[PDB]
Design a protein around this nucleic acid. Sequence first.
DNA 1: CGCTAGTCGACAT
DNA 2: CGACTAGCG
Length: 347
Amino acid sequence: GIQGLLQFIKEASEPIHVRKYKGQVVAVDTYCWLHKGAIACAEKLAKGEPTDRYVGFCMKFVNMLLSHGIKPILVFDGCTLPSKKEVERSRRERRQANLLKGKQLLREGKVSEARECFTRSINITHAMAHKVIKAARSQGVDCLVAPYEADAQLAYLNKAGIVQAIITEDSDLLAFGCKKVILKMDQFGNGLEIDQARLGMCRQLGDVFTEEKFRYMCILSGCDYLSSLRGIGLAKACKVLRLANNPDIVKVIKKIGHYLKMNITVPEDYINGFIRANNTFLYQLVFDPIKRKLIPLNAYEDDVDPETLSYAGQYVDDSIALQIALGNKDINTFEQIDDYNPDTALY
DNA sequence: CGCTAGTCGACAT
DNA sequence: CGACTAGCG
Ligand SMILES: [Mn+2]
Ligand SMILES: [Mn+2]
Ligand SMILES: [Mn+2]
Ligand SMILES: [Mn+2]
Ligand code: NA
């Protein structure tokens, strides 16, 4: 996420209802509904007991969107991203820790805290996601497993005109360059839409409302790919970019002390890390549903050389990418767990 | 005022 | 994979 981004650009938001997008296509960051639905049956999942509450939970939202005349395209997280593997190790070990801690707190008699500790152990498997996938295919709803992060895939689907809005709880989508993002949507359709064009309404941003500058700001504040410098948040980063009349961000990051009046030392790790983060936001591998090909989020600029972008996602053969995207190929074992075919029945 | 970092809701009975 | 809020620059 970009910590505190929503309240920072709150002036560009607008309370709406999804009825607004009737007769149009909307992509969904399904992990949110998956997580929320998985909260309801934390004990069943932790113990390993069979359950399918989260499926119906997601299907409520899906059927709702279908009822209001929307065509939803559920998008799911795929393979792990190397840039994001630190946090994905942290969350893992913490999940295990709270799992065992809850298992022990079950024996104290404090069942009230064992379940709260089971809440911090929710691990959304790809099998659950695939249950949701078949459940969605039942009502003739298209699904798409991102080659890596769902964020990038959604961003592409939005910037390519395939969808007109994105349903998520994550503010990362704005940093990826989404035109329209619908946050905090309930089971009835009440949501909070953030439009990119309205970023100019935010006084705090100043002239930092262009996609590139906005990206730089979000990265400088601290993201999932690169932790920020101690004492650097959204406001100070935005201040840096505002006071900086320089197309070359590197020298600016170097003169961050001159811009912020703070004696800040910039390590050599942070420059490379910044270029890493920017290249991750720009050229993370997504999946084209039309041409059925593995492509970066944005077209490669002459500035960067793709050979040094393994962290932004590794390429594979397009057929395998297709079988992953359909959910037919297991993300982990790479073995065929299903055989759905859109040919013999978005693409 | 701005930022870090820890707490605790989210679902829902 | 988030919204607050105290505690500190
Ligand atoms: Mn995030
Ligand atoms: Mn995501
Ligand atoms: Mn994200
Ligand atoms: Mn400027
Ligand atoms: Na920060």
